[PDB]
């Protein structure tokens, strides 16, 4: 029999414990892109 004011914050911490920061991907994000301006040699 604990006071609900503290029970709520223990429930909040327990829920926060399931947070996921990273992620798993097959390919990395694009870092460099290219622009063409009617030239066959330079971009």
């Amino acid at each position: 029999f604990t006071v609900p004011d503290v029970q709520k914050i223990l429930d909040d911490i327990k829920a926060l414990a399931a947070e996921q920061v990273y992620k798993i991907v097959k390919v990395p994000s694009i870092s460099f892109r290219h622009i063409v301006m009617q030239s066959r040699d330079r971009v």
Binding site: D12, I13, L16, Y22
Partner: protein, 100 residues
């Protein structure tokens, strides 16, 4: 979880402590309570409630906060290490895309 969140808050405050000296032209009127309030506003509310469970009965001020931040005790974790690396990577403000 509680230890990791406290460590992250300590690291954030420790790194934000130097902005007034680094850029005096933008933060001439800046006070420590400003970044203390910012870090409090950008933190989970559960650890804030845990701290308020005692700070509502007892009074603390800026000196206690500074002493607590300067204390050398960190709880290692994934988020803490990644946050420290992120703060180390953003040392130069040209990476943040703002200059004078």
């Amino acid at each position: 979880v509680y230890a990791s969140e406290l460590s992250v808050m300590k690291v954030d405050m420790r790194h934000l402590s130097l902005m007034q000296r680094r850029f005096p032209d933008v933060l001439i009127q800046a006070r420590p309570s400003h970044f203390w309030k910012a870090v409090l506003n950008d933190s989970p509310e559960a650890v804030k409630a845990v701290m308020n469970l005692s700070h509502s009965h007892n009074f603390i001020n800026i000196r206690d906060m500074m002493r607590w931040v300067m204390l050398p005790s960190l709880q290692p974790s994934l988020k803490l290490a990644l946050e420290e690396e992120a703060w180390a990577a953003a040392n130069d403000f040209e990476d943040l895309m703002l200059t004078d």
